[PDB]
Design a protein around this ligand. Structure first.
Ligand SMILES: Cn1c(=O)ccc2ccc(F)c(CCNC[C@H]3CN(c4cnc5c(n4)NC(=O)CO5)C(=O)O3)c21
Lengths: 722, 725
DNA sequence: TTACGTTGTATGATCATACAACGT
DNA sequence: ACGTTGTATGATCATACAACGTAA
């Protein structure tokens, strides 16, 4: 039993539901009104059928099963020949479910135009959130309706307990039946194109799901976001046009992917999943000095506390943060099979691996508790998570992330820590610093390989001025004992792949100067593959140039400095803009940290003053406590003391009545007064704060920095043979 | 995978390593000596190859990959020269790894006996424990001397720790190379079946790896357990070993681990270790019955990273089984999401799309956990503590029951009614010399979580509960409406869809031409409603029902094997009287421990209160001593004849407590604690008082958690109707 | 009369997609 | 044309082990 069939052929009311996965499929099949309804499970996502011919959809198995399970052949039939009466799209209310629904809708448009023109295609409106503040069960579908509860929430008892349905599997079968399956209360919407909106629907769908219209999708997203800035409805409708449903669903999915899935934040240089992973690891006490713990617990904590997504993506992000060959400055230190340079994805499983935070990760979490960043409730509302991290160094450039989203993408390469820190310090010293001065300090990307960067300085200047660009890297080809020994490989290049590519040269004998191909790599020499050419009359250097031109020993890397800025909007920024925005972020975080410490110092100083007042009149204070029935107001009135100070006096212990504790209090008061003076002076003068920032950056660079790994030297274009 | 072949054909020294999986495969491939060694991954276990013919081993991919990767066809001969000289087994030192090694050894002996006689079979001895103090690489596997190289760290920093390395994944590739792959430090052992002991080896292996002789292996296990007051000065280093020793020891270890830690429940809490770890981790997560639901992914991660060193899928399956009402008579887990269906129990969702919490019944296992009721043991990493047992207020081993299969033994404990078992326990406490028949007058028998009917006679049930082993039978519950048979209840673990398919198969084959309409009128209001409409009112529907019972799944049998781990720590088959008596002993022990814990707390607090009152009487002198003496504790002890803990309590008193209201509160606390101490000592001093308290507690638990019997017991005929010319 | 199918903790892996952007 | 980079949507397979009941 792969699908679910009914026990009736009456086309009047027979219904088929296309669900996301068998996790929801089980709930749908157990909650179904069989002989009336049917459920068809799909193995995950489907394929964009807009840019594929109607005769060529015979490769995927989900759509093949749909075609066998549906009367309509994939071509434009228009005949009735229908198995199930009503065809419904049952996709989860999350943005990813909306994307799957949009893909299914595109498939239903390019191949089943009759099923929409006749009016037999329906879309389910499943809820995503349930609010239970009492006997006031409330359901919502989107975050824009999960925030309208802040209106009728005029209660001070019975706190709301929001529950987010992770798709449909989280939903109980009876709840799913009542919301989206039982016709007496289900919110099914008939999707109609009609002659009035046929052209409009075709135009919008072509704009959305086209491989070449991505520019017009960027324009669409920009325009809608801009007019959303101005104005951030559901009228309980039984029918809707495709041009509205598909447009809204793809807008939601694109915005979610752009701002919550694939683009990093300028401050911490992390995508949301990475931030949640690091925060959950910190909350587990998995600091660099702690003992290793199973990655399974970390993944479970991330999924059950902050991230409502899959296991595999979280584990892949963890491995990427832990792999030295993927991250220039890894955030995770691991024990076990954490991948290999030739096969990065050959890592073990969360049951057979141990993980801990790296020392570098301290630069993202040292100031987390000192009111530095804003915090937001999690999906269930039972916890709080940091929206950002107090990055002491600009991790967006030191490590860099590569990601692809809807409309946009990003390919930020890593850079050297010390050089970027020096650039930031120079920018602080001279705010009106040109890009060229910074490029004289950073010189460009610093990949985690000992290979060479061959792109010219002028091209790098163009890339760092316009943002977009491409860099190129080569190999080290130094000769020892008359034999060529390759010691360093380009980034994301497998030695086995290079050997297999060279084997094409060996078999085709385009260059018959070779005499063997062996890999003598060992633990002492990480990569040692020896290629023995002819004698010393052939000038093998040009043959190496040809090999660079043909094989993967010289490769290019895209650069797209696209990120979410402090304004909350994606944008492409140059080196100067990135550094300025990160400096603003660091100044803000340092100000918040200083204010937090100042508040703590002032409160403790007030308490210490009250304690000293109590110590001066200890006998009278004890007499008042032992004689007066309400000693707190009496203490407040007699000594002109505050309620918090009176409570501190009342909470003093007998052991503190000794003179040594009084001396300790006096010393603490003196030190805290000096600290308060220093903090107030720093917060009052801009130059003092700039000096503090420069000192912190220099100290962090000296304590956590390292030398450049990939030297930058200009090289020729190579290329040969024709 | 792609067998990661080497770049050399020298048959003299080429080595192939069989690993347990690509998780360990990556580390092995990174730890390999290039063209000197090779690694072939295996997808878990393969098969017991002892009782399979030499022509039936070659298959699609399991044995075929090994045979191709080695060249030697399993023909007991043909020792050619194709791929690799030496064949090595790289299995983890854990009991499952020993099982894998035993299976591989069976495959290599029953079909490649020449490859062992000539000497080409080696076993790796990888370490399981790691001490990580310094920058001096340490590896060693052992259990008798949990010391050793540790002691050579009396000149560096750091305190002893423990790393269990899981099975192989936790090892770093370089660590794997140093331990079991690089010959300069590798500890490989050549497995040789000497010609002098071959007859003995075949005798042992036939005892071990036989589908039918495995049953009577309990005598081997029983003897080894009995001879526990003996132990091998260790096996030291031999550089070579006989299979008769290696296979016997490995299979003994694996069988003991499966019996006592994987498949048999403990008599006290009635739980297998994985279930206990799940429940404990849920309790430590605050997932009480009154708490909010949390994602099962977090629970599984906690179980795997804190207490259970095994796979996630098995843990999730056990959790789902504990949560399904149609699987557990008294479920321990309450869930939100797709937690399965009675017709498709394994159709549940995933731990990312489901929420879980402990059930109210689970309180009966954890309410007294925080006291001194149970023993605690360090976990695998040594950074936490785990309860060896749970303070079961009721005998969950009989109320819920578990079914499991292990090496040598198995167990099929059926569920029972809570109230009936509680009444039986109360009667046993009242009359210790109560016969089995008297208990059976209260306990009617098993109580499955279905409204179906139990048809086995009372005498047969008595025989089952007297001899332990037996079999029970259940028949569906059906009712006639409008002259048509309506089935309302189905037997346990029976899908309605399966019954409908079976009856439709009979209808299509026209075995029963008296039928006229087989319909499924099941709905949410009525869980099971299967309607059989016969062709008219002259058809003997009773005989057709008897035929269906004899032929379809409407009548099913259930094995009963009351095998469990007793308080002695040894598996045994126990009868109803033995189970009840042993659990009563366990409950008495736990209650005594709880009372002693509360008594100790009460006495310590009374001591502190006495010190506080003494301080209150002489507050001025105490304050003067504190303000004048640098070390006030000995001075207070000398002046007031007071204890060190009392002196510290006086020093930790707050100024707000110096008021008269706090003194009155302390005096009231003292009076209440004196009464509590008197009551606890009276209960602990008299057996009759403790027995009365136990009866009261059992009755209260039965009244708060009990329910009526779900499966009535009514005797029915043998059926066996129709199917004749 | 002899071969298959369960129950349940365990050993373990593999399959099809979206989405932007450039080099081959 | 294809093949990558990486967070995301959802699943699929081969076994051990005891003990009885179909069932062919
Ligand atoms: C994992 N595979 C393979 O290799 C090979 C083939 C294959 C075929 C179909 C499949 F469908 C799967 C996935 C199994 N089904 C996934 C479960 C596991 N899981 C989860 C979550 N969080 C965890 C954890 N497991 N494990 C821990 O230890 C703690 O964290 C879920 O939520 O769905 C497969």
């Amino acid at each position: 039993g792969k699908l679910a069939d009914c026990t009736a052929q009456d086309l009047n009311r027979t219904e088929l539901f296309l669900v996301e996965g068998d996790s929801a499929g089980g709930s749908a099949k157990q909650a179904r009104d069989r002989e009336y309804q049917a459920i068809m499970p799909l193995k995950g996502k489907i394929l964009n059928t807009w840019e594929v011919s109607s005769d060529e959809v015979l490769a995927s198995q989900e759509v093949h099963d749909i075609s066998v399970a549906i009367g309509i052949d994939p071509d434009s039939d228009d005949l009735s020949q229908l198995r199930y009466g009503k065809i419904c799209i049952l996709a989860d209310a999350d943005s990813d479910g909306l994307h799957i629904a949009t893909l299914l809708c595109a498939l239903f448009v390019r191949h089943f135009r009759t099923l929409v023109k006749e009016g037999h295609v329906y879309v389910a409106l499943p809820p995503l959130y349930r609010i239970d503040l009492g006997k006031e069960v409330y359901y919502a579908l989107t975050e824009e309706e999960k925030t309208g509860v802040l209106e009728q929430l005029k209660r001070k008892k019975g706190k709301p307990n929001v529950q987010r349905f992770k798709g449909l599997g989280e939903m109980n079968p009876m709840q799913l039946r009542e919301t989206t399956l039982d016709p007496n209360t289900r919110r099914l919407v008939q999707l109609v194109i009609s002659d009035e909106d046929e052209q409009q629907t075709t135009a919008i769908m072509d704009m959305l799901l086209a491989k070449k219209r991505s520019e017009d999708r960027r324009n669409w997203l920009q325009e809608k976001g801009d007019m959303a800035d101005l104005e951030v409805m559901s009228d309980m409708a039984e029918r809707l046009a495709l041009h509205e449903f598909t447009e809204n669903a793809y807008l939601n999915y694109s915005m979610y992917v752009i701002m919550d899935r694939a683009l990093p934040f300028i401050g911490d240089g992390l995508k949301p999943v990475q931030r949640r992973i690091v925060y959950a690891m910190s909350e587990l006490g998995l600091n660099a000095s702690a003992k290793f713990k199973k990655s399974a617990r970390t993944v479970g904590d991330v999924l059950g506390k902050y991230h409502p997504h899959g296991d595999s993506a979280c584990y892949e992000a963890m491995v990427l943060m832990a792999q030295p060959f993927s991250y220039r400055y890894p955030l995770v230190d691991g024990q076990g099979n954490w991948g290999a340079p030739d096969d990065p994805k050959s890592f073990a499983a969360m049951r057979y691996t141990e993980s801990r935070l790296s020392k570098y990760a301290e630069l993202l979490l040292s100031e987390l508790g000192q009111g530095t960043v804003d915090w937001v409730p999690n999906f269930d509302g039972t916890l709080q998570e940091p929206k950002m991290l107090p990055a002491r160094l600009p991790n967006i450039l030191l490590n860099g992330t590569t990601g692809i989203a809807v409309g946009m993408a990003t390919d930020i390469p890593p850079h050297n820590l010390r050089e970027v820190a020096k650039a930031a310090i120079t920018l602080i010293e001279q705010p009106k610093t040109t890009l060229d001065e910074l490029l004289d300090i950073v010189q460009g990307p610093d990949f985690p390989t000992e290979a060479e960067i061959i792109t010219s300085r002028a091209e790098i200047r163009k890339i760092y001025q316009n943002g977009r660009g491409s860099v190129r890297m080569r190999a080290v080809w130094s000769k020892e004992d008359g034999a060529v020994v390759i010691s360093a490989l380009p980034h994301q290049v497998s030695g086995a792949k290079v050997l297999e590519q060279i084997a094409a040269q060996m078999r085709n004998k385009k260059l018959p100067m070779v005499d063997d191909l062996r890999d003598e790599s060992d633990h002492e020499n990480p990569t040692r593959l020896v290629i023995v050419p002819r004698s010393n009359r052939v000038d093998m250097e040009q043959v190496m140039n040809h090999l660079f031109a043909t094989t993967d020993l010289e490769k290019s890397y895209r650069i797209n400095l696209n990120m979410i800025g402090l304004d909350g909007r994606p944008a492409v920024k140059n080196l100067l803009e990135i550094l300025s925005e990160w400096l603003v972020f660091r100044r803000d975080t340092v100000r918040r940290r200083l204010n937090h410490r100042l508040e703590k110092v002032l409160k403790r100083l007030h308490i210490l003053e009250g304690l000293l007042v109590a110590f001066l009149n200890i006998d009278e204070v004890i007499e008042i406590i032992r004689t007066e029935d309400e000693p707190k107001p009496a203490l407040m009135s007699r000594f002109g003391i505050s309620e918090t100070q009176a409570e501190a006096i009342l909470e003093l212990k007998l052991r503190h009545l000794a003179k040594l504790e009084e001396m300790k209090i006096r010393g603490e008061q003196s030190e805290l007064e000096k600290e308060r003076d220093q903090l107030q002076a720093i917060l009052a003068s801009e130059r003092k704060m700039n000096n503090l920032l420069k000192k912190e950056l220099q100290a962090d660079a000296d304590a956590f920095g390292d030398d450049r790994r990939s030297p930058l030297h200009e090289r020729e274009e190579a290329k040969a043979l024709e």
